[PDB]
Amino acid sequence: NNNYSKLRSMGYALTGAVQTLAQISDINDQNLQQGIYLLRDHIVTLMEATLH
Amino acid sequence: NNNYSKLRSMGYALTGAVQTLAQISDINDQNLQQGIYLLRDHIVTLMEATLH
């Protein structure tokens, strides 16, 4: 119950949240980019044949 | 003006920012996903008719 101790403990928790939030943000952004790339590739493949 | 008090007050502010940032990130990601889904649905609907 030291005045510094229950502050050090909260300092421990106040950084894993930031780290995990960054990780989830990166995962979401990468998934969105991959989906967009797959969609554009399929669209181009479909688009060539009708022109020909 | 207690040495712990003006630290507790800053600890108060140093978490709502993280919470709101997470909320805004989720909102943006969901909006992007919904837009992509709407675009792909419309593209598929347009794509079937020209093939037929």
Partner: peptide, 13 residues
């Protein structure tokens, strides 16, 4: 959410 809640719990005492 639990981490932020514990952060807010580690200050009311």
């Amino acid at each position: 959410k639990d981490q932020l809640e514990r952060a807010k719990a580690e200050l009311l005492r």
